[PDB]
RNA sequence: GGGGAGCCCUAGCACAGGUGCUGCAUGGCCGUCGUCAGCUCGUGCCGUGAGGUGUUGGGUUAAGUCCCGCAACGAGCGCAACCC
């Protein structure tokens, strides 16, 4: 499924503008792009969704940040059914750091709906 | 009959007074740049740090007015609004 759907539409591109280590995971780079190699792909896989799998079984949240049309529409929906939060914009700054200035912004928003529904 | 008080007279005294200088010792009060849109705070990030950031970028407005971007998200005095 994971190596065989995945030649279904995607695997190397970019032209030659690569960063080092990302070559690491990379066979060919030819016929103009890069070719990634599933291998790696799967076995960071079986790793990823290990993590995902105990992170999810016992309750915690992870993000979908995509910004970028494609990405940005189908992280949305999928977080709604996945729950998380998504951010298909402009990721601000201070987002993870300024947690308490978010906070501020959020209590804000919460009394948009309040003061809204009077 | 005198002493005492508001009460005026004269010497003496402590004093008043002076629109005499000093706005380059000052307050207050007006000017003026100028209703020009300007001066900054908060957590976060960048910078050894002074500090930067926010406020530099584009369209737009009477406007740091608003939008877009965006390492920031906003917040106060200004502009406006509450006043005639």
Redesign the pocket.
């Known amino acids: 499924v994971k190596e065989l759907l995945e030649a279904g539409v995607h695997f190397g591109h970019e032209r030659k503008r690569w960063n080092p280590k990302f070559a690491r995971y990379i066979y060919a780079e030819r016929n103009g792009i890069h070719i990634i190699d599933l291998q790696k792909t799967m076995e960071e896989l079986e790793r990823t969704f290990r993590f995902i799998e105990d992170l999810a079984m016992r309750g915690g949240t992870i993000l979908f940040v995509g910004?970028k049309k494609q990405a940005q529409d189908i992280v949305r929906m999928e977080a709604e059914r996945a729950g998380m939060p998504y951010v298909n914009?402009?990721?601000?700054?201070?987002?993870?750091?300024?947690?308490?200035?978010?906070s501020?912004?959020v209590h804000?928003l919460e009394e948009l709906e309040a003061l809204f529904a009077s």
């Open positions: 910004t914009q402009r990721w601000l700054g201070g987002m993870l750091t300024n947690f308490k200035t978010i501020q912004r804000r």
